[PDB]
Every structure is written in structure tokens, then in C-alpha cells.
Design an enzyme around this catalytic site. Structure first.
Site, PDB file in Angstrom:
ATOM      1  N   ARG A   1       0.730  -1.225  -0.080  1.00  0.00           N
ATOM      2  CA  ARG A   1       0.213  -0.072  -0.093  1.00  0.00           C
ATOM      3  C   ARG A   1       0.957   1.343   0.103  1.00  0.00           C
ATOM      4  NH1 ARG A   1      -3.007   2.670   4.781  1.00  0.00           N
ATOM      5  NH2 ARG A   1      -4.254   4.231   3.866  1.00  0.00           N
TER       6      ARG A   1
ATOM      7  N   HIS B   1       0.642   4.087  -2.933  1.00  0.00           N
ATOM      8  CA  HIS B   1       0.349   5.234  -2.678  1.00  0.00           C
ATOM      9  C   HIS B   1       1.362   6.301  -3.100  1.00  0.00           C
ATOM     10  CE1 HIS B   1      -3.648   4.991  -0.115  1.00  0.00           C
ATOM     11  NE2 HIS B   1      -3.657   4.074  -1.240  1.00  0.00           N
TER      12      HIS B   1
ATOM     13  N   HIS C   1      -5.299  -6.319  -3.531  1.00  0.00           N
ATOM     14  CA  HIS C   1      -6.221  -6.614  -2.443  1.00  0.00           C
ATOM     15  C   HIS C   1      -6.191  -8.072  -1.880  1.00  0.00           C
ATOM     16  CE1 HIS C   1      -8.365  -2.677  -3.240  1.00  0.00           C
ATOM     17  NE2 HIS C   1      -6.973  -2.599  -2.491  1.00  0.00           N
ATOM     18  N   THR C   2      -5.559  -8.832  -2.969  1.00  0.00           N
ATOM     19  CA  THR C   2      -5.272 -10.300  -2.456  1.00  0.00           C
ATOM     20  C   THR C   2      -4.591 -10.472  -1.502  1.00  0.00           C
ATOM     21  OG1 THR C   2      -5.188 -12.473  -3.555  1.00  0.00           O
ATOM     22  CG2 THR C   2      -3.441 -10.971  -3.900  1.00  0.00           C
TER      23      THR C   2
ATOM     24  N   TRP D   1     -10.028  -9.008   2.297  1.00  0.00           N
ATOM     25  CA  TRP D   1     -10.552  -9.208   0.862  1.00  0.00           C
ATOM     26  C   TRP D   1     -10.474 -10.970   0.871  1.00  0.00           C
ATOM     27  CZ3 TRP D   1      -7.836  -4.823   1.438  1.00  0.00           C
ATOM     28  CH2 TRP D   1      -8.404  -3.838   0.984  1.00  0.00           C
ATOM     29  N   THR D   2      -9.541 -11.520   1.613  1.00  0.00           N
ATOM     30  CA  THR D   2      -9.340 -13.124   1.350  1.00  0.00           C
ATOM     31  C   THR D   2      -9.168 -13.939   2.550  1.00  0.00           C
ATOM     32  OG1 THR D   2      -6.982 -12.954   1.072  1.00  0.00           O
ATOM     33  CG2 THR D   2      -8.215 -12.374  -1.018  1.00  0.00           C
TER      34      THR D   2
ATOM     35  N   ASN E   1      -6.752 -15.640   3.181  1.00  0.00           N
ATOM     36  CA  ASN E   1      -5.398 -15.906   3.545  1.00  0.00           C
ATOM     37  C   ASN E   1      -4.877 -14.560   3.134  1.00  0.00           C
ATOM     38  OD1 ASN E   1      -4.799 -19.028   3.916  1.00  0.00           O
ATOM     39  ND2 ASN E   1      -6.634 -18.634   2.339  1.00  0.00           N
TER      40      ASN E   1
ATOM     41  N   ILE F   1      -1.079 -14.352   1.783  1.00  0.00           N
ATOM     42  CA  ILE F   1      -0.713 -15.068   0.645  1.00  0.00           C
ATOM     43  C   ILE F   1      -1.243 -14.409  -0.699  1.00  0.00           C
ATOM     44  CG2 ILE F   1      -1.345 -17.463  -0.536  1.00  0.00           C
ATOM     45  CD1 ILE F   1       0.453 -17.484   1.966  1.00  0.00           C
TER      46      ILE F   1
ATOM     47  N   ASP G   1      -2.361 -14.514  -4.101  1.00  0.00           N
ATOM     48  CA  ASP G   1      -2.601 -15.515  -5.387  1.00  0.00           C
ATOM     49  C   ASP G   1      -4.061 -14.748  -5.942  1.00  0.00           C
ATOM     50  OD1 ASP G   1      -4.732 -16.391  -3.578  1.00  0.00           O
ATOM     51  OD2 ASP G   1      -4.028 -18.068  -2.901  1.00  0.00           O
TER      52      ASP G   1
ATOM     53  N   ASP H   1     -14.086  -2.122  -6.078  1.00  0.00           N
ATOM     54  CA  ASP H   1     -14.168  -3.877  -6.539  1.00  0.00           C
ATOM     55  C   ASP H   1     -15.138  -4.259  -7.354  1.00  0.00           C
ATOM     56  OD1 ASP H   1     -11.414  -4.193  -4.968  1.00  0.00           O
ATOM     57  OD2 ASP H   1     -12.914  -4.340  -2.993  1.00  0.00           O
TER      58      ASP H   1
HETATM   59  C1  HEM Z   1      -8.505   0.341  -7.700  1.00  0.00           C
HETATM   60  C2  HEM Z   1      -8.562   1.379  -6.650  1.00  0.00           C
HETATM   61  C3  HEM Z   1      -8.296   1.203  -5.359  1.00  0.00           C
HETATM   62  C4  HEM Z   1      -8.987   1.603  -4.384  1.00  0.00           C
HETATM   63  C5  HEM Z   1     -10.462   2.156  -4.140  1.00  0.00           C
HETATM   64  C6  HEM Z   1      -8.218   1.207  -3.431  1.00  0.00           C
HETATM   65  C7  HEM Z   1      -8.970   1.455  -1.707  1.00  0.00           C
HETATM   66  C8  HEM Z   1      -8.316   0.623  -0.602  1.00  0.00           C
HETATM   67  C9  HEM Z   1      -8.927   0.889   0.747  1.00  0.00           C
HETATM   68  C10 HEM Z   1     -10.064   1.702   1.092  1.00  0.00           C
HETATM   69  C11 HEM Z   1      -8.148   0.018   1.511  1.00  0.00           C
HETATM   70  C12 HEM Z   1      -8.221   0.025   3.102  1.00  0.00           C
HETATM   71  C13 HEM Z   1      -7.293   1.054   3.742  1.00  0.00           C
HETATM   72  C14 HEM Z   1      -7.245   0.876   5.451  1.00  0.00           C
HETATM   73  O1  HEM Z   1      -8.389   0.976   5.893  1.00  0.00           O
HETATM   74  O2  HEM Z   1      -6.377   0.130   5.783  1.00  0.00           O
HETATM   75  C15 HEM Z   1      -6.974  -0.401   0.617  1.00  0.00           C
HETATM   76  C16 HEM Z   1      -6.108  -1.174   1.311  1.00  0.00           C
HETATM   77  C17 HEM Z   1      -5.171  -1.887   0.394  1.00  0.00           C
HETATM   78  N1  HEM Z   1      -4.857  -1.672  -0.766  1.00  0.00           N
HETATM   79 FE1  HEM Z   1      -5.964  -0.545  -2.243  1.00  0.00          FE
HETATM   80  N2  HEM Z   1      -7.166   0.530  -3.289  1.00  0.00           N
HETATM   81  C18 HEM Z   1      -7.075   0.229  -4.635  1.00  0.00           C
HETATM   82  C19 HEM Z   1      -5.981   0.119  -5.391  1.00  0.00           C
HETATM   83  C20 HEM Z   1      -4.948  -0.483  -4.918  1.00  0.00           C
HETATM   84  C21 HEM Z   1      -3.803  -0.844  -5.842  1.00  0.00           C
HETATM   85  C22 HEM Z   1      -3.589  -0.426  -7.198  1.00  0.00           C
HETATM   86  C23 HEM Z   1      -3.010  -1.617  -4.862  1.00  0.00           C
HETATM   87  C24 HEM Z   1      -1.745  -1.968  -5.184  1.00  0.00           C
HETATM   88  C25 HEM Z   1      -1.381  -2.806  -6.237  1.00  0.00           C
HETATM   89  C26 HEM Z   1      -3.544  -1.712  -3.465  1.00  0.00           C
HETATM   90  C27 HEM Z   1      -2.992  -2.177  -2.615  1.00  0.00           C
HETATM   91  C28 HEM Z   1      -3.698  -2.318  -1.345  1.00  0.00           C
HETATM   92  C29 HEM Z   1      -3.359  -3.213  -0.236  1.00  0.00           C
HETATM   93  C30 HEM Z   1      -2.260  -4.323  -0.145  1.00  0.00           C
HETATM   94  C31 HEM Z   1      -4.200  -2.691   1.014  1.00  0.00           C
HETATM   95  C32 HEM Z   1      -4.273  -3.594   2.389  1.00  0.00           C
HETATM   96  C33 HEM Z   1      -3.372  -2.657   3.409  1.00  0.00           C
HETATM   97  C34 HEM Z   1      -3.223  -3.359   4.620  1.00  0.00           C
HETATM   98  O3  HEM Z   1      -3.437  -4.724   4.865  1.00  0.00           O
HETATM   99  O4  HEM Z   1      -2.763  -2.464   5.541  1.00  0.00           O
HETATM  100  N3  HEM Z   1      -4.928  -1.078  -3.574  1.00  0.00           N
HETATM  101  N4  HEM Z   1      -7.379   0.012  -0.702  1.00  0.00           N
HETATM  102 NA    NA Z   2      -4.605 -13.600  -0.147  1.00  0.00          NA
END
Ligand code: HEM
Ligand code: NA
Ligand SMILES: O=C1O[C@H]([C@@H](O)CO)C(O)=C1O
Length: 250
Positions: free
Chosen positions: A38, A42, A163-164, A179-180, A182, A185, A187, A208
Site C-alpha cells: 500500500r 500510494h 487486495h489479494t 478481501w481473502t 489468506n 498469501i 494468489d 472492487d
Molecule cells: C483500484 C482502486 C483502489 C481503491 C479504491 C483502493 C482502496 C483501498 C482501501 C479503502 C483500503 C483500506 C485501507 C485501510 O483501511 O487500511 C485499501 C487497502 C489496500 N490496498 Fe487498495 N485501493 C485501490 C487500489 C490498490 C492498488 C492498485 C494496490 C496495489 C497494487 C492496492 C493495494 C492495497 C493493499 C495491499 C491494501 C491492504 C493494506 C493493509 O493490509 O494494511 N490497492 N485499498
Molecule cells: Na490472499
């Protein structure tokens, strides 16, 4: 495509290789791969192609950019990485954060995303408001990823697969849960879960769900749910492009 990567010294390259190893161990032990992905996303996702502003140039650690509401919680990631970064003074923060994102994907079992060094740290953060809004839909996704960043529809769907791993937090975005089943992980389960409907205990954002009803995005969701190898290939391509927005003549 379109990239001419800069020359860096042998000592810089040695530091990249050693930092990659240190990051693997640290991220695996701390269980923070999702937060690091993330952070990298960002940092990179603020790029605007028309003005050539924003992008993966190390500005996310500035208190002004960490204060953006879209970045709630990322101060944790910056703090976690600071002791490790201090072991590699030669590296730019820009490179270090993008490397951490590549490593996050690798240590959770995802594809090996190619990495090229040489990003220079920039002085000023971009303006707030460029990152996507989870309550909006496909038109908004194309405005942010396409019109601003310059990425394709395929890249939007593959990158949404980030989000996997991980979860939302009610104290950060307000959304809550993984979202998953796991969340450490990497995948194709994000796409499988999207297609099967809402399972209790799992999250789906409106952004999503927009992938399922768009004519171009839906075939991609279907493909990735059926074929994890196709997802890994397209994800690696899209992540590399994201991590290099505005970098290496772009
Ligand atoms: C498509 C548009 C996207 C939207 C609207 C979006 C929105 C969000 C939101 C609302 C969260 C939760 C933040 C929190 O409350 O902790 C999140 C988490 C996350 N996003 Fe996305 N996101 C998008 C795209 C992406 C992209 C492009 C990636 C990386 C390739 C990504 C990777 C992640 C990851 C790994 C988390 C989990 C963070 C954690 O576990 O602390 N996201 N996203
Ligand atoms: Na997963
Ligand atoms: O991915 C994450 O890692 C940390 C924590 O769970 C382990 O350090 C955190 O708060 C996240 O959202």
C-alpha cells in the site's frame, strides 16, 4: 516500454541487492507486506502524466503527504522502514519504497516484479486528492488510472488484485476486514471471491464491485479467476509500470 533507465554506480547496485535481502527478512518477520505494498502504491499512484507531477519519488514520507486522508496508517509503514533505510544511506527513499513494494509481493508468494534503480527523491509532494475513491465506480477508475497515471484497463484490473493481500481498517479508511481468507498469501483469490459473491467475514469495496459490471473489466476478472498464471503475468507488468511512472523518461 518507452523506458531508458539511468546509470547508477556499482556501489549503488550492491546496496540495492543487499537492501532487497534485508527487506525480505524484515517484512516477512513483521507481517507487514500488505501495508508496504500500500505504501509503494500510494507513493506511485499520485502521478499525473499531463503535468509530470507526483509519482514514486520519495515524497510520501513528508509529514504533509502522510497527512492526506487517503494515507491514514502509512505513517506506521514509514516508521517501520526508517531503521532499515538508515543502513543503506546511498539509496534514494524513492527506490527504497518501490523496492519494499516489490519485496512485499515476492515474500507473500506473488510474481517477481522487475526492479530498476535510479529514482531521484523530489522536494515537493503532489497535491492531495489524486488517489482513487473506494465508493466510486468504473468511470472514476479510468479517470485516475487512465487519464492521470496513463495505465491501461488491463492494468486497472490486475493491480486491483493487490487486495489479494491485506485488509481494511475502520480507523484508517473506515472499511474493515480482509478481501481473502489468506491475507498474507498473494494468489488469484481476490478474483475468485469477487465472482462468488459476498461471504461473511470478507470485504468487497464498491470499487472492487465496479470491475464485475464493466464490459472491459469483467472479462479480465473472469480470466484471472480461471488462470492464476495469467494474473501473475499481468500483475507483474502493471506493478512494474506503476513503480516507474514518471521515471526513466516516462
Ligand atoms: C483500484 C482502486 C483502489 C481503491 C479504491 C483502493 C482502496 C483501498 C482501501 C479503502 C483500503 C483500506 C485501507 C485501510 O483501511 O487500511 C485499501 C487497502 C489496500 N490496498 Fe487498495 N485501493 C485501490 C487500489 C490498490 C492498488 C492498485 C494496490 C496495489 C497494487 C492496492 C493495494 C492495497 C493493499 C495491499 C491494501 C491492504 C493494506 C493493509 O493490509 O494494511 N490497492 N485499498
Ligand atoms: Na490472499
Ligand atoms: O499490513 C499491515 O502490517 C501491520 C501489522 O498488521 C503487522 O506489522 C499493519 O498494521 C498492517 O495493516
Amino acid at each position: 516500454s518507452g523506458k531508458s533507465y539511468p546509470t547508477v554506480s556499482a556501489d549503488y547496485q550492491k546496496a540495492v541487492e543487499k537492501a532487497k535481502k534485508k527487506l525480505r527478512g524484515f517484512i516477512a518477520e513483521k507481517r507487514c507486506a500488505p501495508l508496504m505494498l500500500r505504501l509503494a502504491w500510494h507513493s506511485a499512484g499520485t502521478f499525473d502524466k499531463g503535468t509530470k507531477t507526483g509519482g514514486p519519488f520519495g515524497t510520501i514520507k513528508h509529514p504533509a503527504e502522510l497527512a492526506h486522508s487517503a494515507n491514514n496508517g502509512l505513517d506506521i509503514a514509514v516508521r517501520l522502514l526508517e531503521p532499515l533505510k538508515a543502513e543503506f544511506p546511498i539509496l534514494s527513499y524513492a527506490d527504497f519504497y518501490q523496492l519494499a513494494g516489490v519485496v512485499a509481493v515476492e515474500v507473500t508468494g506473488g510474481p517477481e516484479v522487475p526492479f530498476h534503480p535510479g529514482r531521484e527523491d523530489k522536494p515537493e509532494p503532489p497535491p492531495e486528492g489524486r488517489l482513487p475513491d473506494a465508493t466510486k465506480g468504473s468511470d472514476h477508475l479510468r479517470d485516475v488510472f487512465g487519464k492521470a497515471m496513463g495505465l491501461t484497463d488491463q492494468d486497472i484490473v490486475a493491480l486491483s488484485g493487490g487486495h489479494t493481500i491485506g485488509a481494511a481498517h475502520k480507523e484508517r479508511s473506515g472499511f474493515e476486514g480482509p478481501w481473502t481468507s489468506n491475507p498474507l498469501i498473494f494468489d488469484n483469490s481476490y478474483f475468485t471471491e469477487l465472482l462468488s459473491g459476498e461471504k461473511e467475514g470478507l470485504l468487497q469495496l464498491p470499487s472492487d464491485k465496479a470491475l464485475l459490471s464493466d464490459p472491459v473489466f469483467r472479462p479480465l476478472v473472469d480470466k484471472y479467476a480461471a488462470d492464476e498464471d495469467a494474473f501473475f503475468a499481468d500483475y507483474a507488468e502493471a506493478h512494474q509500470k506503476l513503480s516507474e511512472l514518471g521515471f526513466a523518461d516516462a
